[PDB]
Amino acid sequence: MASTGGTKVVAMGVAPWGVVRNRDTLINPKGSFPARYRWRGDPEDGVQFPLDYNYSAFFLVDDGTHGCLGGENRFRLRLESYISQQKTGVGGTGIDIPVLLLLIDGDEKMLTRIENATQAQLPCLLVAGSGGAADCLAETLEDTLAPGSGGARQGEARDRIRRFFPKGDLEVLQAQVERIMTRKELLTVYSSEDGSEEFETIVLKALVKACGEASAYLDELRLAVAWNRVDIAQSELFRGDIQWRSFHLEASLMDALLNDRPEFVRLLISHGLSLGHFLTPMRLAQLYSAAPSNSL
C-alpha cells in the first residue's frame, strides 16, 4: 500500500497444522476449494493462533495433535536446505540459490534453531540491538580473538548469556553457542543503524563470506545479475577493491545472457570481456540450450 505500483511480494508462512484454530477442514476431495477462512470470530487468544491473510502461501505442517510449535522446525530446515541445493537461472544453470535466516530476537529454542542452520550451511543474518537470541549472539560474534581479551572472555560468556536469559540450564546454552561459533562465518551481524538501505548489500555481504572456497563460487557479481538489480552490479564493479579477474567476469556474462537481462550485458562489455575466449563454442551451445521449450 506504500508503493502503489509494487509487484505483490510473495511470502510463504510455514505454520504447524495443530495451531490454526479456525480450521474449516478444507475439502477432503482433492483439496480444490476456494474456501474462505473465518478471521475475527474468536474470543480465545491462547495457544490457538489463526493464520494470516497476507501470505501468498501457508505450508501447514501436521506433526501430531493440536499443540506445540515444534514440528514445523525440522521441516523448514529440511526445506531451506533443499532450496539452497536448487540452482537459479533459465535452464537450471547458474548459481545455487541464496538462502538466509534472518534472526530477529527469539528464545532458548531460537539458539538451537540456528545451530541446525549452520549444520546445513545457512548464512544467518542476526540483527544487532534486537534482544533475546540475537543480541546474545551479537555480543559473541564481536567477541572474537582480536576484539576479545583472549581467554578471559571464556569466563565472561557465563555472565552475558544470563543477561538475555533469566531461564535455567545455562550450561548447554553456553556450550551450544561455541558449536555455532565453530562455523562463525556462515553468520554475520546486521549492524544496528548501519543499514536499512544498505541491507540489500549486507545481505550481499553475508553470502560472500558464506561462499568464501567450496560452494560453487558465488563471485558476488554473478549474484547481482541473478537478482536482476543493476545498481548493485555497477557499484560492485565500479568500486570495492576492483580486482576482477577473467573467470569472475566470464560466468557472470553467461547468467546475463541465459537469464535475459540485457542491461547487465552492456555493463560487462563496457568493462570489457575477451569475446574470443568468451565465445568458445560450448558456451554458444550452452546459449542455445536455454531456449524455451515451447518455442518456434
Binding site: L257, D260, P262, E263, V265, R266, I269, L296
Partner: protein, 49 residues
C-alpha cells in the same frame, strides 16, 4: 533488447539490420501463435527503421 545491443557492437551494421529484418519476418511466418509473431514482427520494424 539484446538483439538491439548486439547490433550496436558488430560490423556489417546496415546489412545486419536488413538481415535481422529478413529473419524476423521469416520467423513471424513460422510462429504458430499471433502473439509471438506480432512481437517478433514488431522487432523486425525496429531493425528496419
Amino acid at each position: 533488447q539484446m538483439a538491439m545491443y548486439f547490433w550496436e557492437m558488430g560490423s556489417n551494421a546496415v546489412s545486419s539490420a536488413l538481415g535481422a529484418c529478413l529473419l524476423l519476418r521469416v520467423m513471424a511466418r513460422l510462429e504458430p501463435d499471433a502473439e509471438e509473431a506480432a512481437r517478433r514482427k514488431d522487432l523486425a520494424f525496429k531493425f528496419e527503421g
